[PDB]
Design a protein around this ligand. Structure first.
Ligand SMILES: *[C@@H]1O[C@H](CO)[C@@H](O)[C@H](O)[C@H]1NC(C)=O
Length: 72
């Protein structure tokens, strides 16, 4: 059995705003299920051009740090 958090790129988007891409991790493994074992949170600011009154939004994003073989 093995399970690893692997670096990925991921899209952070929101209706009416410009999507950004950030580093995150994804679980990859074979458990003889590979799920997040440690995580944290980040604030990602998206620019929303066109919208003068709310020109940006902060989206809260969970960052996976480590993964492990866990029940279900
Ligand atoms: C995965 O991402 C972190 C974040 O910067 C980086 O420091 C680390 O070296 C990366 N791991 C690999 C295997 O590239």
């Amino acid at each position: 059995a093995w399970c690893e958090a692997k670096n990925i790129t991921q899209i952070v988007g929101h209706s009416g705003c410009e999507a950004k891409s950030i580093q995150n991790r994804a679980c990859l493994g074979q458990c003889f299920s590979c799920m997040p074992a440690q995580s944290m949170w980040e604030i990602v600011t998206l620019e929303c051009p066109g919208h003068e009154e709310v020109p940006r939004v902060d989206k809260l994003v969970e960052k996976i740090l480590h993964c492990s073989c866990q029940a279900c």
